């Protein structure tokens, strides 16, 4: 096992030159440095470890270092370099698996001062340097400040343009932090048994003797990094065309709304409290005011004529008068994007808000707006125009105007490369961003069809044939309820699992909770299973907490296994708990549940523990599943990539969207995904049968 880190001239996207690289080997126990002209030897050093069946440790290597060495080795040395996944370890991945709750563990580090504020809860190499006490400095700082003591200025991200010995040493600094970080992680006996020395074993023993989560998170990271590079083919012309239609509609709506509501003045700037004129008491419900410290009617003297009383001085042009308070105001034009302006105009028209926010302001969301009623017919009809407007803005903001709009991320290759943290959420779910491809409006929401159709394999033309690709959309059928069925099989011996199979599980929950409609039941189970209070539950059938408590107690009496399961979870985790000023104060026996692959899954709250358990199982089942699917596809001969047969484009919790060169391959992808899901189910002795459903089509709108 060796430990390494490199330095290049840019982000993966535009990296062209390899600067330096350090390799700490555990056998020899000594470092070795590589400079620009040593890149050839550096790559050889890595291949040797692979020849020995060893391991290579990189911090953030799956996403950067390895693919960067693949790209740099081609354009610089014109050589084929491909580090086999099974030989690579990624501290950033282990870090995210073992310390999935850095946010809390850090509060103590924030207060003490051993960890800078900006690095709060960061898994970055530097952040770990401060946690381990290995940080003697940061390169970008020994450069920026050292740039002053040299004259020249600084350009956002330029400390990496050219190689310099100062870089070659901070490069070493980064290898010792990696090594120290690795040993800190290998010392966690829950993931790495003591009976084995992991800094001294073969890759086959490293994966088989460590907790299974270690292997899964590494395969998931390798595959997801790959998916980010494939990217999602995106139809720019369609989205730009949509932006025009929406902007024109936004303008027409703005015009009509500024005609209904006009302009008006409103307090802006006041700092002190207006005091009652006669009594002097502070009056809080009046806008704040400004009390000028200067100003008058006549400019103070300075001439011997007025230095006693005689020749007139000079009147004051100033508008204020020291002493007299005024309410500063601004003139504002109605802005339909302002919840504040909406609530101001409607209240003026006779609307009396019912629900408020903790900060006092009246709630103005889609729900309440839908129910607002005022006597001014014009004012009333305008509410639907405000609703449309807000929705229009949401779409425009996501597709074109926002900092992170899709139009701002399309690459030259006509694809959106969304990044994904495979292990970003506590439950183990992945998180998506830059942009969040896991949040594109559904085909069921306004303008959702058009938005979805813009993301599709059809927008990628094959590099050989020129023909558009095809899309395969696969989802894991009812994954959450099936996971719940696996966990209660312990108390009901597969009774509920069989209910799923027979079909119509929602009808069964309806009968047990005694709800009037099948839809009330679907909306009940998820609300109930995840913590909903008695009120929200009652509101399903048009009632309150009263109907709520009876709705849940009925459900639990009819579904004993669920009650047993919750009680079981409650007693393993909580010692005692109490309510104080609205918040629940808990005392834990243990703050974590074990996951399907052995990892510790941190629990935030008791009412949400069951959701933690199910979201976690669904997340790990899906992680293993998309891993196994790609493994079976590659094993059947299909090649992964655009220059190949299929390309992973997006993984959104329980679903994947796969680009396929031909319909025939789409069909194989779909069948394979189902074979892999059954494999996963047998692999973990799952007590409920798992399934998937696939759809072929040109884009995301059709494949769902």
């Amino acid at each position: 096992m060796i430990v390494s880190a490199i330095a290049a001239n840019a982000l993966l996207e535009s990296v062209t030159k390899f600067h330096c690289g350090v390799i700490y080997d555990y056998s020899t126990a000594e470092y070795v440095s590589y400079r620009p002209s040593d890149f050839g030897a550096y790559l050889d050093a890595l291949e040797a470890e692979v020849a020995r069946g060893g391991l290579i440790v990189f911090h953030n290597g799956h996403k950067y270092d390895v693919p960067a060495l693949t790209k740099l080795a081609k354009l610089q040395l014109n050589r084929e370099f491909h580090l086999p996944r099974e030989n690579c370890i990624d501290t950033l991945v282990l870090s995210r698996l073992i310390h999935s709750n850095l946010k809390d563990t850090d509060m103590g580090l924030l207060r003490s001062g051993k960890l800078p504020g900006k690095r709060f809860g960061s898994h970055a190499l530097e952040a770990w340097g401060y946690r381990l006490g290995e940080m003697k400095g940061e390169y970008k700082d020994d450069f920026k400040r050292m740039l002053e003591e040299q004259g020249e200025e600084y350009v956002d991200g330029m400390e990496w343009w050219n190689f310099n010995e100062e870089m070659m040493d901070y490069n070493v600094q980064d290898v010792v932090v990696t090594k120290a970080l690795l040993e800190k992680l290998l010392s966690d006996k829950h993931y790495f048994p003591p009976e084995i020395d992991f800094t001294d074993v073969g890759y086959t023993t490293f994966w088989s003797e460590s907790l299974e989560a270690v292997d899964i998170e590494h395969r998931a990271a390798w595959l997801l990094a790959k998916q980010e590079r494939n990217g999602f083919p995106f139809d720019t012309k369609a989205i730009e065309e949509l932006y025009v239609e929406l902007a024109a509609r936004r303008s027409e709506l703005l015009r009509k709304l500024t005609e209904t509501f006009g302009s008006w003045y409103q307090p802006k700037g006041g700092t002190e409290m207006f005091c009652h004129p006669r009594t002097g008491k502070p009056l809080p419900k009046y806008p704040r005011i400004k009390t000028p410290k200067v100003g008058g009617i006549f400019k103070k003297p300075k001439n011997k004529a007025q230095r006693e009383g005689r020749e007139p001085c000079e009147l004051d042009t100033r508008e204020y008068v020291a002493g007299a308070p005024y309410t500063p105001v601004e003139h504002v034009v109605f802005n339909p994007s302002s919840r504040d302006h909406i609530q101001k105009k409607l209240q003026e028209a006779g609307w009396v808000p019912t629900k408020y926010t903790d900060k006092g302001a009246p709630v103005v969301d889609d729900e309440v707006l839908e129910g607002v009623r005022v006597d001014d017919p014009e004012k009333q009809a305008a509410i639907d125009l405000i609703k449309e407007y807000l929705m229009i803005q949401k779409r425009i903001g996501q597709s074109a105007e926002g900092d992170k709009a899709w139009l701002r991320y399309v690459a030259e290759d006509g694809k959106i490369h969304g990044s994904v943290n495979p292990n970003g959420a506590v439950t183990g779910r992945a998180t998506h961003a830059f942009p969040n491809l896991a949040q594109i409006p559904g085909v069921r929401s306004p303008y959702g069809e058009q938005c979805r159709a813009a993301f599709g394999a059809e927008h990628h033309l094959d590099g050989i044939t020129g023909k558009p690709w095809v899309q395969a959309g696969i989802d894991a059928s009812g994954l959450e309820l099936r996971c719940l069925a696996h966990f209660m099989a312990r108390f009901d011996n597969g009774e509920y699992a069989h209910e799923i199979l027979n079909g119509d599980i929602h009808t069964k929950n309806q009968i047990a909770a005694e709800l009037p409609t099948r839809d009330n039941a679907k909306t009940f189970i998820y609300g109930f299973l995840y913590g909903a209070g008695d009120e929200k539950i009652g509101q399903i059938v048009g009632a309150g907490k009263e109907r709520g408590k009876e709705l849940k107690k009925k459900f639990l009496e009819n579904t004993p296994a669920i009650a047993a399961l919750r009680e079981s979870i409650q007693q393993t985790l909580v010692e005692s708990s109490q309510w104080v000023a609205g918040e629940q104060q808990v005392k834990w026996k243990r703050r974590w549940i074990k996951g399907l692959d052995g990892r510790k899954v941190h629990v935030r709250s008791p009412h949400a523990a069951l959701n933690t358990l199910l979201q976690s199982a669904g997340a790990l089942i899906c992680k293993l599943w998309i891993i196994k699917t790609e493994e079976m596809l590659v094993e059947k001969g299909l090649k992964h990539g655009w220059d190949g047969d299929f390309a992973y484009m997006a993984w959104v919790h329980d679903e994947i969207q796969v680009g396929c060169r031909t319909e025939e391959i789409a069909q194989v992808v779909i069948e394979t995904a189902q074979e892999a899901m059954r494999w996963v189910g047998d692999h973990w002795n799952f007590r409920c049968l798992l399934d998937t459903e696939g759809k072929m089509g040109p884009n995301w709108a059709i494949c769902h």
Binding site: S263, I297, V321, A324, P325, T327, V329, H331
Partner: protein
Amino acid sequence: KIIHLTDDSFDTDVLKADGAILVDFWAEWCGPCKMIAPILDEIADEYQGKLTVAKLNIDQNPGTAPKYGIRGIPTLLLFKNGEVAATKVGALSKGQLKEFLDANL
């Protein structure tokens, strides 16, 4: 003695009209505005025949205020013959209000 107003009659009441007019731009939701109303009651009585007071509610008549550029309230505008002779912003005291009127007439 105090004259009300409207975006309409404003023209044919403040602009034309010979003599001096002190116009108050107020708003029902302003503290300073409501406290200087009393002082204006007295002044509207004292200075009769030498100037007439006129109040304008910026909420009911949104058209006129923008024209002069209100930046705070209450705002006292001094209209001579038909022009803006002088303006003062704030809740002046009875004694301060006087000095202002005794320096622009």
